[PDB]
RNA sequence: CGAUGUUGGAUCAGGACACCCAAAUGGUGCAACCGCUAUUAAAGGUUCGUUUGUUCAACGAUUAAAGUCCUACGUGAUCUGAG
RNA sequence: CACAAACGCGUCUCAGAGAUAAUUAAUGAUUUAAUCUUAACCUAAUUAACUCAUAAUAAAUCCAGCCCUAGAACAGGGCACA
């Protein structure tokens, strides 16, 4: 959640999480919702809203976020561990903004 | 840059590292803090 | 063992071509086995005032290995006599330079300190890579055995070999490789 | 052949004349050496892997000498060429492009006007000398009260290392001997007696053989490229040179008498 | 081993986990109750920097260590075989284990030194210019002191300074 | 000839150094170590 | 001690690096110019004068700088002899 | 400067490539972040030395005399023009 405060997020539009609470393979999807959830990047920007999608049919978590350069950013978290998907969000969303 | 025959972290910002065959204190904050070990 | 004298007596202090493999060797071992076959220490008719001595073919003297980091660390000095004329070293320089030289040194180093090192060095003969005089190849009686023995690369084993080598451990799926 | 980048021609085996002053039409003075092609021939020629392994070998004559005081040997060499003896032969490093015919004239023209050369030569001997002349040590003083001193080379040596030196500096030979200037540029040719005008001093005493070749020196490398390439051939081009050929800021014999504005 | 997968669509990107299949340890150890994957197949004081085929099986694709929790290594045999690994890489064996790129295999540079059993990285160190006497003498290291300990055969310790 | 209480650590005779070398303490190894067990 | 002739100069310097200059850098209570420190580097350099027998030292003028030392306080079968 | 020379106070010429130390970086494991790495692989930026391109030298044996910008002696260059 640091990392992420240090990048200036203001070059996000939009961030949802959609995923399913019951299924076993859902630890890392949320590690992420609680670290793009926290003050800091938070308060980074306030034009970029934060949305959690929880179902519990849906059986695959995910992340879509949209950033002003017309990008659209989606990471299916199954096997992909947490900082995995924040590092890719690093790299993909502050290099390109 | 100083050479010392002990090292030690001035600082919380300070890292270990060894290079050359040597240890090394390096600190980004404090470039004062550098130190070689000897 | 019925022969004339003349004849007998030249077979007995015949000399012997021998051919030594470098590739991959210590300067060192080679060295040795080099040193021993020059002075002729191999022969039970050995005496230090019979010129007995073979003649010593090393070969692919470039692809010499040493242990350790011996190529950084050992360094070969000389002086050329004139004021400020010391000239220090190391031996990836010295190689990198003249291939022969290592293993020539070593070998001029392990030899006896008389006037005879002088001499029983005009019999050894080395070339960097295999390309040999026909001449000198001519004269080869027998190959001697590489005294390391040198490791496979990873590469180099039978799918055969890898799989009759035991997995060790069981890694768990959802760890990344 | 054509010419290839990083090639490198033949050279001559010339005469020093003398000097002589020359001028430049920024009004600067120069002194410049003389020196004539007499009898310049290629005698024979080493290939490239019977030589250096790398750079090919022309070896040429310089200027002809009586038959008779020259040796059974050298005579058959000539013999079999079909030239008379050359005083002076001297090897020069060509490569394989480059190569002339065994029994081929060189001529002054070879060089043109702005270019660099380098001429190697004897110097000029002076003998055996004393460490002042051969050195340039200075002495010990003259008159306040030295005795026997006032020129020897003092002490030679350290106390404690109880030997002398190698490359102690000592009296002796100095002078016959052979040394290379570089970095000359020429400035003139003279056609008719085949003489080159190279700038500054040429060492060698006057009347002395020496051997020209373009200047190895780096800045000058490529400067081929525009020269007379395998050698020049006064039969070829079936159009005569003037008789003289020189250098753009060189203040000719005849001229307008320079007049600055 | 899970793969990551990366995808470029019109301006769209996709970032996906996939499953491949994993090798199993082979089905009979000689000592079950043994702990540590080394002891269990009685492997340890056994195995050198010459042994590859046991090396290569705790590496990264691009020659790096595994680390030690995953492997369950114990943690003495686990530095040992570090010290191996880094041993042979700097032997010239496992050379699939380096990281691949394009460009780099094309300057040559002069053909690779020999060397082996090498404790120290060759950029770190110094040459040693004064030797000295028989009394005080720099003696260069051979192979690592964390090997120390195997079976010696011949019965003489392993020579690890000269 | 040095006192019998110096401050450089005095050279021992051979013969005692060969006494000191041979007495070192040896520590017990185990059969197998006690980590690599159950 | 049946002699290993002694201070400072002259001449010629050999060497160390614990670097005075030249080169490459780290830190600064380094803005820039100056500096003050520390690291690496010893191929080449390291002035001329007034007074002292002087080595030191003081002073004049300069230098990119006018290094610290070792060599029987280098060097008298090469010189000097002021002490 | 009273020898045809020697000489300075006068005139000419003087260089490419590779290598490194300290120290900066890039990729990246042990320690799935980091991290210049007595971890690998390729890597870059980088003092002086020091090596090396390159230059110089480089024709085995005629030599009595006589000349010489060659020389203590010995050697060495000339002696067919003219
Ligand atoms: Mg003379
Ligand atoms: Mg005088
Ligand atoms: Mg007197
Ligand atoms: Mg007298
Ligand atoms: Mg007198
Ligand atoms: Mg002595
Ligand atoms: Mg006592
Ligand atoms: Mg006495
Ligand atoms: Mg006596
Ligand atoms: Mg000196
Ligand atoms: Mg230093
Ligand atoms: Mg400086
Ligand atoms: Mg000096
Ligand atoms: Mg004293
Ligand atoms: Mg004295
Ligand atoms: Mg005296
Ligand atoms: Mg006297
Ligand atoms: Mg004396
Ligand atoms: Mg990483
Ligand atoms: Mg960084
Ligand atoms: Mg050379
Ligand atoms: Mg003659
Ligand atoms: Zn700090
Ligand atoms: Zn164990």
């Known amino acids: ?97 | 840059f100083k050479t010392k025959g002990v090292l030690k972290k001035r600082c919380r910002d300070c890292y270990l590292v060894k290079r050359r065959g040597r240890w090394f204190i390096y600190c980004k904050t404090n470039p004062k803090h550098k130190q070689r070990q000897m | 063992s019925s022969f004339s004298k003349a004849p007998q007596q030249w077979a007995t202090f015949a000399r012997v071509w021998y051919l030594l493999d470098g590739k991959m060797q210590p300067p060192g071992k080679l060295a040795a086995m080099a040193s021993v076959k020059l002075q002729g220490l191999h022969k039970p008719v050995y005496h230090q005032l019979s010129d007995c001595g073979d003649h010593v073919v090393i070969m692919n003297t470039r692809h010499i290995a040493f242990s350790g980091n011996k190529w950084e660390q050992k360094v070969y000095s000389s002086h050329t006599g004139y004021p400020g004329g010391f000239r220090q070293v190391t031996a990836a320089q010295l190689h990198q330079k003249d291939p022969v030289a290592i293993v020539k040194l070593a070998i001029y180093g392990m030899l006896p300190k008389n006037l005879h090192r002088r001499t029983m060095m005009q019999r050894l003969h080395l070339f960097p890579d295999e390309d040999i005089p026909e001449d000198i190849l001519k004269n080869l009686v027998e190959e001697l055995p590489q005294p390391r023995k040198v490791p496979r690369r990873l590469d180099e084993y039978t799918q055969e070999e890898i799989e009759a080598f035991p997995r060790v451990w069981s890694p768990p799926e959802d760890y990344r490789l | 052949h054509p010419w290839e980048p990083g090639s490198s021609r033949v050279g001559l085996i010339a005469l020093k004349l003398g000097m002589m002053p020359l001028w430049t039409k920024d009004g600067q003075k120069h002194v410049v050496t003389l020196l004539q092609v007499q009898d310049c021939h290629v005698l024979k020629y080493t290939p490239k892997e019977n030589h250096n392994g790398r750079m090919a070998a022309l070896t040429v004559g310089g200027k002809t000498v009586s038959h008779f005081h020259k040796s059974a040997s050298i005579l058959e060499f000539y013999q079999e060429l079909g030239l008379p003896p050359k005083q002076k032969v001297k090897i020069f490093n060509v490569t394989e492009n480059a190569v002339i015919k065994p029994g081929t004239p060189l001529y002054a023209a070879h060089f043109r006007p702005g270019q660099y050369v380098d001429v190697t030569a004897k110097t000029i001997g002076k003998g055996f000398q004393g460490v002042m002349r051969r050195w340039g040590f200075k002495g010990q003083p003259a008159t306040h009260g030295q005795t026997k001193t006032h020129r020897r080379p003092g002490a030679i040596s350290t106390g404690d290392v109880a030997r002398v030196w190698p490359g102690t500096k000592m009296p002796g030979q100095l002078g016959n001997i052979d040394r290379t200037a570089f970095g000359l540029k020429v400035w003139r040719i003279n056609t008719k007696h085949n003489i080159i005008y190279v700038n500054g001093s040429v060492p060698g005493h006057k009347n002395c053989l020496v051997k020209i070749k373009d200047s190895k020196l780096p800045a000058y490398k490529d400067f081929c490229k525009n020269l007379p390439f395998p050698t020049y051939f006064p039969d070829g081009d079936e159009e005569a040179l003037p008789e003289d050929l020189y250098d753009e800021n060189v203040c000719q014999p005849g001229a307008p008498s320079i007049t600055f504005t | 081993f899970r793969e990551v997968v990366e995808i470029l669509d019109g301006k769209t990107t996709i970032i996906e986990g996939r499953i491949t299949e994993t090798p199993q340890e082979s089905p009979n150890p000689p000592n079950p109750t043994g702990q540590c994957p080394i002891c269990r197949w009685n492997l340890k004081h056994k195995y050198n920097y010459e042994d590859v085929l046991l090396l290569s099986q705790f590496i990264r694709p691009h020659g790096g260590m595994l680390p030690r929790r995953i492997t369950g290594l114990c943690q003495e045999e686990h530095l040992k075989i570090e010290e191996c690994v880094k041993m042979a890489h700097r032997a010239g064996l496992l050379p699939n284990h380096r990281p691949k790129l394009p460009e780099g295999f094309v300057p040559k540079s002069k053909p690779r030194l020999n060397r082996y059993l090498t404790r120290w990285s060759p950029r770190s160190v110094k040459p040693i210019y004064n030797k000295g006497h028989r009394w005080n003498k720099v003696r260069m290291p051979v192979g690592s002191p964390l090997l120390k300990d195997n079976v010696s055969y011949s019965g003489r310790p392993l020579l690890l300074y000269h | 000839g040095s006192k019998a209480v110096t401050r450089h650590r005095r050279v021992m005779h051979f013969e005692r150094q060969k006494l000191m070398a041979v007495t070192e303490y040896i520590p017990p190894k185990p059969t197998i170590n006690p980590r690599c067990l159950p």
């Open chain 1, 1 to 97: 959640a640091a990392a992420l405060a240090r990048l200036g997020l203001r070059a996000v539009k939009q961030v949802r999480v959609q995923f399913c609470p019951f299924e076993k393979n859902v630890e890392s999807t949320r590690t992420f919702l609680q670290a793009v959830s926290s003050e800091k990047v938070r308060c980074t920007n306030l034009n970029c809203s934060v949305i959690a999608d929880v179902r519990h049919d849906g059986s695959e978590p995910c992340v879509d976020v949209l950033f002003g350069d017309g990008h659209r950013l989606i990471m299916r978290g199954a096997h992909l561990t947490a900082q995995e998907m924040l590092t890719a969000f690093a790299s993909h969303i502050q290099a390109r903004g």
